[PDB]
Amino acid sequence: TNTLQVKLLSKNARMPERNHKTDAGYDIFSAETVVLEPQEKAVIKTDVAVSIPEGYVGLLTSRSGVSSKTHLVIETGKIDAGYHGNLGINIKNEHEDDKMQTIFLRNIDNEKIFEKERHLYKLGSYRIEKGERIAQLVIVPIWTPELKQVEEFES
Amino acid sequence: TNTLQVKLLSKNARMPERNHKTDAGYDIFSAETVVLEPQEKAVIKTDVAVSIPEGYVGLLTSRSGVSSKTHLVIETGKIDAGYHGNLGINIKNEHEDDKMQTIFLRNIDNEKIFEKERHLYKLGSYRIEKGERIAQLVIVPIWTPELKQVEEFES
Amino acid sequence: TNTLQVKLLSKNARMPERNHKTDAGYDIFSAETVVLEPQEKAVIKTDVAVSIPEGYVGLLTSRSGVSSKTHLVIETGKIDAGYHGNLGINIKNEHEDDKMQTIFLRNIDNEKIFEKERHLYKLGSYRIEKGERIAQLVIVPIWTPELKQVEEFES
């Protein structure tokens, strides 16, 4: 106990990292560079697996920085105990498609990505680089009792 | 203890079911067949009540399959201890209204619903059938202390 | 133990309040009157700080009433232990921008705000008043072990 196993599935993966000693969440990094157009969905790969013990659940969830600044919305993922597969970050660019163009992609701090080669993108598009802090994993204990069907409650 | 009471409110309701032994969430089924147009909201009825004991909270939340494949977004519901009412799934079709038509509704796996009778729908519309796994209930313990107002923290 | 410190940062702030004895969440009030146009984002200030102890995490999250009735979407905030700063409610008006006008703002119950002075707003705009129940704080215990890297899991 007091030990969580972590299995890196690739060279692109990075070990989960906790910001402070007091903090609750382990920050999670992307294993791939992805461009998301307005309204576009994706399951961004972490290339990290973990073995959550029985009587616990992981919460692969958004960071307040990224979610407040940008229209990148991560749907909180309920990481089951025993799931040793690749942790996917369930993400959607929730910026509106207003049929407008721009030479600037946007980073995860909602800042213009300057670049030498000029390219037209859809306005509201974002780019997430390889190995950026876009999510965090918070583990909490769970209650998994037997279900007893009843006609009325005892209270 | 180690027992959760479940009260079926209708013939349309189904008993909550856990997928595996190791898993954290009890999968929840719809009690009604619903069509959601783009941007349309609803509180889909489960027709299941539960008695969560004191010192716990239920999390009626999305499944990673349905949320990744489709624009159906369930807002996680905080199920209080003692709430013996009908569990509503708080859902919105977050697909954009782009003023386009199609003969195909979409199922919860983002697949075309073929049908003999031809009908025009709005593009991005979904249909959820009676008794489909669209949500899951994860129960976690909670901390409910007394609040003491202070001018500064003791740390 | 069984005591949470709460520090009001302003006269506009209100003490967090639990609805019932059995309930899990402490309801949180806005410290500022804010108008959110369609698609507009904000970090609405509570002007309340709290000292969550070690081995716990706060969940600053939406209420089922406000989220079901309106397109106001609060992204659940993961409140770390030791964070003594101002609690921001991470909110976005997820109503579509359909380029239409109206004389009516909308309140957090999705009801028309009548007013003597006539003003044109964008359709789907909301207003949140000073000191309205728009969020709730649920505290849960957490598991914060050491991470051990491994080539394969022990199971």
Ligand SMILES: O=c1ccn([C@H]2C[C@H](O)[C@@H](COP(=O)(O)NP(=O)(O)OP(=O)(O)O)O2)c(=O)[nH]1
């Ligand atoms: O965001 C997520 C969510 C889940 N997952 C993984 C972890 C979890 O153990 C597994 C199953 O989660 P769900 O039960 O919520 N998905 P679903 O019920 O649709 O599929 P399954 O049939 O596997 O339960 O998917 C992710 O990688 N990312």
Ligand SMILES: O=c1ccn([C@H]2C[C@H](O)[C@@H](COP(=O)(O)NP(=O)(O)OP(=O)(O)O)O2)c(=O)[nH]1
């Ligand atoms: O998605 C949900 C969320 C909540 N609920 C139920 C369970 C819970 O016990 C009850 C109250 O939850 P909230 O406190 O979050 N809603 P609100 O604070 O707006 O209303 P109330 O005055 O009842 O607290 O609503 C659902 O059925 N589905």
Ligand SMILES: O=c1ccn([C@H]2C[C@H](O)[C@@H](COP(=O)(O)NP(=O)(O)OP(=O)(O)O)O2)c(=O)[nH]1
């Ligand atoms: O909705 C929120 C979410 C977080 N917070 C505060 C509480 C928490 O202690 C602090 C940090 O939360 P995150 O770790 O999720 N944000 P991020 O990882 O982007 O920044 P940091 O570098 O501070 O970790 O922000 C809010 O006030 N409102």
Ligand SMILES: [Mg+2]
């Ligand atoms: Mg962090």
Ligand SMILES: [Mg+2]
């Ligand atoms: Mg499942």
Ligand SMILES: [Mg+2]
């Ligand atoms: Mg409440």
